[PDB]
Amino acid sequence: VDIDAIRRVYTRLLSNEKIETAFLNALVYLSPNVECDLTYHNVYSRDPNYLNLFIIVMENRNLHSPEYLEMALPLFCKAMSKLPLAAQGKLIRLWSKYNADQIRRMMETFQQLITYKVISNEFNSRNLVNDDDAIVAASKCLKMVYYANVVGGEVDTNHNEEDDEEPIPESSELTLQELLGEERRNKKGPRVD
Amino acid sequence: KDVTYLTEEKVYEILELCREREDYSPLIRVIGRVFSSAEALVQSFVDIDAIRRVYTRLLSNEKIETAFLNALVYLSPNVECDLTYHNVYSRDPNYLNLFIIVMENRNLHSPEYLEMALPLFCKAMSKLPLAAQGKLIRLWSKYNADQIRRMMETFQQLITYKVISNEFNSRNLVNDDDAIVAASKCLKMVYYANVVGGEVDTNHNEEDDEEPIPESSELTLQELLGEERRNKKGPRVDPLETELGVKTLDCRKPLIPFEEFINEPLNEVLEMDKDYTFFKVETENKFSFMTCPFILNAVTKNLGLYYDNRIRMYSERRITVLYSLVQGQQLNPYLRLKVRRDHIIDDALVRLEMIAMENPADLKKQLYVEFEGEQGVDEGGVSKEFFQLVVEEIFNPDIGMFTYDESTKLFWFNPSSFETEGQFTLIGIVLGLAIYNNCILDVHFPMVVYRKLMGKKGTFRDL
Amino acid sequence: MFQDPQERPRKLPQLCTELQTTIHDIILECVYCKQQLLRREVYDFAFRDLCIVYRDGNPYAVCDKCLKFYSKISEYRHYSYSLYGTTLEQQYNKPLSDLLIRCINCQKPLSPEEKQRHLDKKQRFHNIRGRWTGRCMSCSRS
Amino acid sequence: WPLSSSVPSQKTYQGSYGFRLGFLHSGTAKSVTCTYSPALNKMFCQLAKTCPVQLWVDSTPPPGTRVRAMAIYKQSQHMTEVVRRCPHHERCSDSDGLAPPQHLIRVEGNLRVEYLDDRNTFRHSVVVPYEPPEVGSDCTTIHYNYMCNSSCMGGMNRRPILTIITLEDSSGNLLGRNSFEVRVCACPGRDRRTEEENLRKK
Ligand SMILES: [Zn+2]
Ligand SMILES: [Zn+2]
Ligand SMILES: [Zn+2]
Known part of the structure; x- marks a missing residue:
């Protein structure tokens, strides 16, 4: 949780090239294990501090340099994209307090990755982008940033809602709805994220 | 030209094209997109020779080597999940093909692999279910000695590398390192391949395990339970020995000497008191190297055995005290022998036999010797002297029990001895007591004797 | 007679x-x-x-009194090794429900409920002279 | 039904092979289908639910040895009566196997089973070949099923029954014998606890 300490530490350590390769080589080792913790051991449900790990890593400014894009960042995305919804909500709420340039940096960090993988791999009607774990994982991360951008903007919820007016269905569907217990349940909303 | 699984011919399609287009990136794209996938690999083939040809062709290009490495680092962590959570082998017994394919790579022992790729692969492999390990070990046992040596070396270098690279101390135990534990379990897999690949004589050399009947108290408790005829249960047997059906003691001659499996750096760092604890009490988060005895040198093993002996001696002392508290009877916590210098063999026999007959558990107490007429505290020196005297007296040709060979300077049992079976029992007990008390004896027996003690008959080759 | x-x-x-x-x-x-x-x-x-x-x-x-006494002595004398129920099931290729285990303090055979308790509390089973033992409810509470 | 019968000897006899029985130690929860009481030497089980029995021997019996199960009423005033399946269950379609509708005991998983009627005493019995223990096992497990409830009118009618297990040679000569009481009931764990508590109270 000690954001500023992390920032100072990175600002001091990343000044040495030899140490940069060590961070990279540690991250490549870390992420695949974290994926197991989240997928099989539900570690976050035992310790809600587990999220600290991701916060610590994301404050690294060099994640968007190509050395990270080729392997380290993809693996980290695979791990992160498995976080349980409540954890994502905790993280997104934090990111929504960051400066626009920082949102831009995070957005760019994943945008470069999605771009890099789309450009580097040959996709066709038999090899779909939908089948690539790296791009899917990256997209789910980027979604996480996207909602941070949403929540970090100006939001007006209390003075602008209008009622959803739905046209009554044809008599046939009405009778089937009446034959079921749904006479007053005509309003259910579209598929919500 | 994307494809889901790979073969030698499919590879050749690209060897030619990459040379013709003066490029390697397409083949690298291919190999990465292949070898990062466990399923692709499992489905790709058993075709050992094809794999060997493929490696012999591909590893000739440096750019492609880094791609193999980078694919393996991606592959293994997923395979660990398959084995740990999805039991994939129980759905598809061909899953083992993956490991066979990877192990035929000759470059796994170069440092680039040792730092990350091989450790991860060991973590995955060491999780295989016993039946799969048995399948793999049986295959390896057909390999050439140099290949066993290579595989042994591949893991030996890793164990050495990790022991040297990491700082181990009484708070950071080697037992807590997944990389070394995983590597050791792999190496165990090789070790049994070496055993099964050697000369094994099982049908003409087994002797019955003769057990001394316990004291009346334990007998009554065994009678109160349904165990009147179940006195023979064997020591802690290794699961792999059960799965393979061959014991370490059955192999007369291995492909590679068992001593080469000893990892001296590891032995210099390993804390045996804690290992013995983990051997006795299973803990989910800690391993015990005593379960992998081939890797420990004789010093380290002896220290483990010494902890066993001392913990038992101490248990017998507790039992002595408990008996005294509940029934008032006063028993000696030591195996106190009192003997006369002019009758060492007789006094020792009568005393050890009365002890063995009245209470066979007493022989497991700490030895303490007193020469009748002499005065001193037996800090081991009196015991050592007692052993010297006994050994000298027993081997004297005038007693006729043993014949001495001038050529080898070794002693052997006299077939014509009229002496009672008592003296032979005594010398047997003395040897036991010497191991139990960590005292070296100047006895000179040929290897057959120690084989017969372990329950194996002497064969022609032991002459 | x-x-x-x-x-x-x-x-x-x-x-x-x-x-x-x-x-x-x-x-x-x-x-x-x-x-x-x-x-x-x-x-x-x-x-x-x-x-x-x-x-x-x-x-x-x-x-x-005699049973508890001699059992406790036998524990002190022929203790071999302690395993988790899960591990024990794999060594004997059978579910713990079916395996013969008695109380180490009073020899009473252990019920599947008590066996489950051992798994729940991550407690080990002790091999004594080659037979397996655990602690029954009336001996884990005392 | 046969209205009279001789009394088979029920005395335990281990013989030259140490023949003894064993039972999987089961709890007393409401969900237990089968459960054994050493204090009552008694088996409590649900109708047509598997009751596992372990066979123990000191030495392997000769080839062709067989294991026979025969039922008698425990109360001496009824020991001359043949234990038969109660008429409502004798009339039930569930007797689709190879055992007579009047046979109370059936063996599960072994098709070498012989459902035999004693020519001289008319008693119903089930026989299987003796099979040595599996590799790694000390004892052989047989699976028995009781096809009628002890409370049944016109059948057991709450009278306790004793199951006698006999180890026999290929000709029927007695190599070993042992026995135990049975109660077929809808709630074994409950009934077991009840009878055990009644015993302890005495
Ligand atoms: Zn008493
Ligand atoms: Zn108890
Ligand atoms: Zn009925």
């Missing part, structure tokens, strides 16, 4: 009917102290699934 070594009843209920008597009627000696058992102990001997010991055709049981 039970002077036939092979053909004398082994379990107390059988001995009741063999002597045309009931558990409420029979009086027996403890094999170590030859003291008479309290009826409470006789019942427990039946509940603990123990065998009658015979000397010269005479039946003997075991009282509570």
Whole structure:
């Protein structure tokens, strides 16, 4: 949780090239294990501090340099994209307090990755982008940033809602709805994220 | 030209094209997109020779080597999940093909692999279910000695590398390192391949395990339970020995000497008191190297055995005290022998036999010797002297029990001895007591004797 | 008489009917102290699934104090190694429900509920002289 | 039904092979289908639910040895009566196997089973070949099923029954014998606890 300490530490350590390769080589080792913790051991449900790990890593400014894009960042995305919804909500709420340039940096960090993988791999009607774990994982991360951008903007919820007016269905569907217990349940909303 | 699984011919399609287009990136794209996938690999083939040809062709290009490495680092962590959570082998017994394919790579022992790729692969492999390990070990046992040596070396270098690279101390135990534990379990897999690949004589050399009947108290408790005829249960047997059906003691001659499996750096760092604890009490988060005895040198093993002996001696002392508290009877916590210098063999026999007959558990107490007429505290020196005297007296040709060979300077049992079976029992007990008390004896027996003690008959080759 | 070594009843209920008597009627000696058992102990001997010991055709049981005492001594003497129930199932290729395990303090066979408790509390089972033991509810609470 | 019968000897006899029985130690929860009481030497089980029995021997019996199960009423005034399946269950379609509708005991998983009627005493019995223990096992497990409830009118009618297990040679000569009481009931764990508590109270 000690954001500023992390920032100072990175600002001091990343000044040495030899140490940069060590961070990279540690991250490549870390992420695949974290994926197991989240997928099989539900570690976050035992310790809600587990999220600290991701916060610590994301404050690294060099994640968007190509050395990270080729392997380290993809693996980290695979791990992160498995976080349980409540954890994502905790993280997104934090990111929504960051400066626009920082949102831009995070957005760019994943945008470069999605771009890099789309450009580097040959996709066709038999090899779909939908089948690539790296791009899917990256997209789910980027979604996480996207909602941070949403929540970090100006939001007006209390003075602008209008009622959803739905046209009554044809008599046939009405009778089937009446034959079921749904006479007053005509309003259910579209598929919500 | 994307494809889901790979073969030698499919590879050749690209060897030619990459040379013709003066490029390697397409083949690298291919190999990465292949070898990062466990399923692709499992489905790709058993075709050992094809794999060997493929490696012999591909590893000739440096750019492609880094791609193999980078694919393996991606592959293994997923395979660990398959084995740990999805039991994939129980759905598809061909899953083992993956490991066979990877192990035929000759470059796994170069440092680039040792730092990350091989450790991860060991973590995955060491999780295989016993039946799969048995399948793999049986295959390896057909390999050439140099290949066993290579595989042994591949893991030996890793164990050495990790022991040297990491700082181990009484708070950071080697037992807590997944990389070394995983590597050791792999190496165990090789070790049994070496055993099964050697000369094994099982049908003409087994002797019955003769057990001394316990004291009346334990007998009554065994009678109160349904165990009147179940006195023979064997020591802690290794699961792999059960799965393979061959014991370490059955192999007369291995492909590679068992001593080469000893990892001296590891032995210099390993804390045996804690290992013995983990051997006795299973803990989910800690391993015990005593379960992998081939890797420990004789010093380290002896220290483990010494902890066993001392913990038992101490248990017998507790039992002595408990008996005294509940029934008032006063028993000696030591195996106190009192003997006369002019009758060492007789006094020792009568005393050890009365002890063995009245209470066979007493022989497991700490030895303490007193020469009748002499005065001193037996800090081991009196015991050592007692052993010297006994050994000298027993081997004297005038007693006729043993014949001495001038050529080898070794002693052997006299077939014509009229002496009672008592003296032979005594010398047997003395040897036991010497191991139990960590005292070296100047006895000179040929290897057959120690084989017969372990329950194996002497064969022609032991002459 | 039970002077036939092979053909004398082994379990107390059988001995009741063999002597045309009931558990409420029979009086027996403890094999170590030859003291008479309290009826409470006789019942427990039946509940603990123990065998009658015979000397010269005479039946003997075991009282509570003696059983606990000799069991505790046997623990101190022939302890071998301790495994988790899960590990034990794999070594014996059978589910713990089916495996024969007795109380280390009082020999009573362990119920599947008690076996489950061992798994729940991550407690190990002890091998003594080659037979497996655990702690029953009446011995893990004391 | 046969209205009279001789009384088979029920005395335990281990013989030259140490023949003894064993039972999987089961709990007393409401969900237990089968459960054994050493204090009562008694098996409590649900109708047509598997009751596992372990066979123990000191030495392997000769080839062709067999294991026979025969039922008698425990109360001496009824020991001359043949234990038969109660008429409502004798009339039930569930007797689709190879055992007579009047046979109370059936064996599960072994097709070498012989459902035999005693020519001289008319008693119903089930026989299987003796099979040595599996590799790694000390004892052989047989699976028995009781096809009628002990409370049944016109059948057991709450009278306790004793199951006698006999180890026999290929000709039927007695190599070993042992026995135990049975109660077929809808709630074994409950009934077991009840009878055990009644015993302890006495
Ligand atoms: Zn007593
Ligand atoms: Zn207990
Ligand atoms: Zn009925």
